[PDB]
Amino acid sequence: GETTDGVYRVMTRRLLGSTQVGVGVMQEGVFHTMWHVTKGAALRSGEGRLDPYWGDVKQDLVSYCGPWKLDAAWDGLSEVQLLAVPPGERAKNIQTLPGIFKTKDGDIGAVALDYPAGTSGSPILDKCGRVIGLYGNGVVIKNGSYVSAITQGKRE
């Protein structure tokens, strides 16, 4: 149905009323979201249907209609903007400087902003407007707060 580029809410009617389970990015006719939002299930866009193309539970990413298109990366120095699309609330750009997740396989960017689980799949942007990753997969720090990683996929 609607394949226009932009940020989208991922909703469901399987519970009470209409519940937002996550967010996603439409870019180049491909819907990008976090795997834990949809679980690989098909999505609906008006009368049209989005069938999954690629997905990985460890990366926690999933693409619809085609391969992963997002390929920008945080430069390790600049402030980014989380386009937070919260449940029931309007889309809102929050500027922050990301921290670092140090792992046995290298360092990853991390936005220290707390949002409901329904915000998962909200894009993280650079000063150019490019999508450098998605919010929704991170850790719970000592003060109960959430610090999500900047999760980017791979463009073939």
């Binding site: 909703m11 750009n93 921290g99 670092i100 991390a110 220290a112 407007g129 719970v140």
Partner: protein
């Protein structure tokens, strides 16, 4: 069955609310894509 709805354009907003810290956390990632705090 899940469905999508447009929420807006993907542009940077000049003069947006600047908040949040930049912490260096030591994490581990398991086969289920779940992060954990290493100490």
């Amino acid at each position: 069955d899940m469905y999508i709805e447009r929420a807006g354009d993907i542009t940077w907003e000049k003069d947006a609310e600047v908040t949040g810290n930049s912490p260096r956390l030591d994490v581990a990632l398991d086969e289920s894509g779940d992060f954990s705090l290493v100490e």
